[PDB]
Design a protein around this ligand. Structure first.
Ligand SMILES: *[C@@H]1O[C@H](CO)[C@@H](O[C@@H]2O[C@H](CO)[C@@H](O)[C@H](O)[C@H]2NC(C)=O)[C@H](O)[C@H]1NC(C)=O
Ligand SMILES: *[P@@](=O)(CCCCCC)O[C@H]1C[C@@H](C)CC[C@@H]1C(C)C
Ligand SMILES: *[C@@H]1O[C@H](CO)[C@@H](O)[C@H](O)[C@H]1NC(C)=O
Ligand SMILES: [Ca+2]
Ligand SMILES: [Ca+2]
Length: 534
């Protein structure tokens, strides 16, 4: 029933889900298979005329989050699960996965010109798909608010398939393939969304975790030039847990070690041209070799095997330097965090129980950090269990004498304080920041990383006021205050500003606070950002 005529004259049919109309699985690029592997996406050249788009297509190949060159139970078990016919059935994945999904309010028509919210999923740049982030909660609330929006989601390559680095990839001009996938989808939205009733000039990009860092990367792309055919690709961005990526260049030391490890694993350790050898191995072999490099939940943790890295061409430099140097798109932004962002990552090093061990783990993790810096870091984040994350839980959650400490460091460097650094240097437009404490008291994890996904897509809670309502008003009017919330969200100018600069959330509701916590950790970490790059 639902129909749309694209920018090339093709008329496609979607699905009527009663509460919304959706067009799922629209191919936006030519399948990145064979010799197209690891390469930039090629625009989809073909005809969709007469086709129905009523189901999500498969996700891109996934990597075992517990993957590693080592052997163990978590790895073995997840592999058992991931290769199961039942898993392969409920959650299909493939190298041919570059599709886009359009979901809208019922009765929407071409010319409606509704604001567009483009979702970029998070999955540690190693797993993930669009199908697991239902847009219905957001769409329904938008209608109820009288501020209807259209939800767009894009599949992008993850893990080795989307983020392979090293000397060969650099020389070839193929770095950050997964981000390029996201970029093409944006371009597809500019060219076709009007046919669906969206306004290509009212696009707000948003993601969580890896998707959020992806949003920051888009703000930094091509030194801030976000135009396509003369017009900006998006008027705003919402970053849920994640800002700049703390990483070395594509041809840096870890980018290359990982490339070589994967090559040995696929049986290309002897190839004169390892990259050409990698294009020739079957999907099985490649999936296997990849599952034998660390996953984001493995001991390596934050020191990820695959993630966005500066390439000197599309992301021209260290991401912290670009932000300092003003090389970003000038747009209004919302960027927030959950109180306890690092408790998940802290679960990866529960065999680290003494301070001597904590010092070596950090040393292993941050190869560019001097002993002085490691020592400053370990003073800024003391062993005192009352000081760590879950924050403000006293002597509880002492899985080990280092869990709370390690959880505090990782969540701050990767998200929470990284956000403050951005906020303190960004002048491209109005800023709004939030800190959630909605799940205070939840054992072991606290107000954990990802909980916002629940309250944005699955259940309603005090947080939904922000994750849905406030986010909908911002995409529509560029001011979250138009949502008519009882607590006015203050503009964030600086972390040193007087007065509350943070919207906050607790189980009962909203309130405002200050972004002045853990200042010693901020300076321990960000006085010279490159000391803690991976
Ligand atoms: C905690 O566990 C990790 C993971 O096994 C240990 O690190 C591995 O140790 C083996 C044996 O020495 C090495 O071959 C691997 O290279 C290490 N893995 C990684 C990912 O680095 C680590 O030594 C243990 N830590 C403590 C404090 O016991
Ligand atoms: P994000 O996608 C992790 C990004 C790590 C960046 C380091 C440079 O992680 C969460 C994604 C979410 C959708 C589910 C759970 C994930 C972890 C917090 C476990
Ligand atoms: C990457 O950079 C080059 C050089 O500026 C540019 O021509 C190319 O179009 C960029 N890629 C993307 C996806 O924007
Ligand atoms: Ca090499
Ligand atoms: Ca500038």
């Amino acid at each position: 029933a639902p129909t749309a005529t694209l920018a090339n004259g093709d008329t496609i049919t979607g699905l009527n889900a009663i509460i919304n109309e959706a067009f799922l699985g629209i191919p936006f690029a030519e399948p990145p298979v064979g010799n197209l592997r690891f390469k930039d996406p090629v625009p989809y050249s073909g005809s969709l005329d007469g086709q129905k788009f009523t189901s999500y297509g498969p996700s891109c190949m996934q990597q075992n989050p517990e993957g590693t060159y080592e052997e163990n139970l978590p790895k073995a078990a997840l592999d058992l699960v991931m290769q199961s016919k039942v898993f392969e059935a409920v959650s299909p994945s493939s190298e041919d996965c570059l599709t886009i999904n359009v979901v809208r309010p019922p009765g929407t028509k071409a010319g409606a010109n509704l604001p567009v919210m483009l979702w970029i999923f998070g999955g540690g740049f190693e797993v993930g798909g669009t199908s697991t982030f239902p847009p219905a909660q957001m769409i329904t609330k938008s209608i109820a608010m009288g501020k209807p929006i259209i939800h767009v989601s894009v599949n992008y390559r993850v893990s080795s398939w989307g983020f392979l680095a090293g000397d060969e990839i650099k020389a070839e001009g193929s770095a950050n393939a997964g981000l390029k996938d996201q970029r093409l989808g944006m371009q597809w939205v500019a060219d076709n969304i009007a046919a669906f009733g969206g306004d290509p000039t009212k696009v707000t990009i948003f993601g969580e975790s890896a998707g959020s860092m992806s949003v920051m990367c888009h703000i930094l792309w091509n030194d801030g030039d976000n135009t396509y055919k003369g017009k900006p690709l998006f008027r705003a961005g919402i970053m849920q847990s994640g800002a700049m990526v703390p990483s070395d260049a594509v041809d840096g030391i870890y980018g290359n070690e990982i490339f070589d490890l994967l090559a040995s694993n696929a049986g290309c350790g002897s190839a004169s041209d390892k990259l050409a050898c990698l294009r020739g191995v079957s999907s099985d072999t490649l999936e296997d070799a990849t599952n034998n490099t660390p996953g984001f939940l493995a001991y390596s943790s934050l020191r990820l095997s695959y993630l966005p890295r500066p390439d000197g061409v599309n992301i021209t430099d260290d991401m912290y330097a670009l932000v300092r140097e003003g090389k970003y798109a000038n747009i209004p932004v919302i960027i927030g965090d959950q109180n306890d962002e690092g408790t998940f990552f802290g679960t990866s090093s529960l065999n680290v129980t003494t301070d001597a061990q904590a010092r070596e783990y950090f040393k292993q993790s941050f190869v560019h950090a001097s002993d002085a810096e490691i020592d400053t870091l370990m003073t800024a984040y003391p062993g005192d269990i009352t000081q760590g994350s879950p924050f403000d839980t006293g002597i509880l959650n002492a899985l080990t004498p280092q869990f709370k400490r390690i959880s505090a460091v990782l969540g701050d460097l990767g998200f929470t304080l990284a956000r403050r650094y951005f906020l303190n240097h960004y002048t491209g437009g109005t800023k709004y920041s939030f800190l959630s404490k909605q799940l205070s008291g939840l054992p072991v994890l606290g107000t954990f990383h990802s909980n916002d996904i629940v309250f944005q897509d699955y259940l309603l809670g005090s947080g939904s006021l922000i994750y849905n309502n406030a986010f909908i008003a911002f995409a529509t009017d560029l001011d979250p205050n138009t949502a008519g919330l009882l607590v006015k969200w203050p503009e964030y100018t600086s972390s040193s500003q007087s007065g509350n600069n943070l919207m906050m959330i607790n189980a009962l509701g909203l309130y405002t606070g200050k972004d002045n916590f853990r200042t010693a950790g901020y300076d321990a970490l960000f006085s010279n950002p490159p000391s803690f790059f991976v």
